[PDB]
Amino acid sequence: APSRNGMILKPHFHKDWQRRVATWFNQPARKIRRRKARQARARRIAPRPASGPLRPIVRCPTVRYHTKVRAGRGFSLEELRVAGIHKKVARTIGISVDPRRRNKSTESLQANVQRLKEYRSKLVLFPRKPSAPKKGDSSAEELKLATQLTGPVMPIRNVFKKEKARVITEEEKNFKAFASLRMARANARLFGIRAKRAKEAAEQDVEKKK
Template sequence: AIKHNQQIPHNHFRKDWQRRVRVHFDQAGKKKARRNARAAKAATVAPRPVDKLRPIVRCPTLKYNRRVRAGRGFSLAELKAAGIPRKLAPTIGISVDPRRQNLSEESLAANVERLKAYRSRVILFPRNSKAPKKGDASAEEVKAAKENFVKQANVTFPIENKAQV
């Protein structure tokens, strides 16, 4: 079944291969370590979500372009339309991709809507609680936010593929 001009495979198992067998007995331990690391990260950044808000993008190529998925970051046009300064966006958990171009009005509108929904729900803690700035949350809102907060942005703002008719 070997075709064309290739080397005939010879099994060179003469190097005490039993000692070199790669085993995965640590699989369960690594799984637990990853889980603990995720929990530790969530506790460290709380009450912020662990992940950033990502845009809705279409997959490339004819085969997959009916599907939507999470993109790398929002375009500058989307941020501008939503009224969010580009320097502020990364500081409040919004990912930005300055290279991205909007090729359709629909995608622009969908992502602007996504940004506005996120912005309406995000609570900005004041840097100085004694002198809060415009747009910062009040003391009651901060207290409420510390009690019930969202761990993941992608769970609160899911990207769903609508069924084709």
């Protein structure tokens, strides 16, 4: 029974919602449970980073965002073949590897290669034996590092490029942004139909010959 200017409300309480009420008094205990397991996870892998393997440079789909850079699922095999690391060795060394990721662009490929190239430089690979085999690390690199890396390894900086204050020329001033935008909007709508008027007229030019 509405009276004197309320909104037409549609509460979804017509079901027996009281049997399925989810209380959140577990929130502080769940935070301790997650945190005490997070510290325990980091103590089992003593020299390894707590966050885990390295994540790639990934741009957003869904043109709403279209500019933000996320932390991806893993490095693709096309990115790994450039850097020279086999796909079954990158998992063991601490590189996230997924086979599903395609690579349509080129600048994003070198972004992930450069991320992997300088990652191998700062990586401290411990030898399997105490007597170090070939292509391990020197004993001088070990003793000054007995700590992990809190947070994600190489945190991804959403960076922009600073522009130089350009001097506007008259050649730029003649450009009409609204007039060109409306022209391109009309060309996209009429691109398919204009291909019909040309082809039947060209077929009508065949009637001139035949």
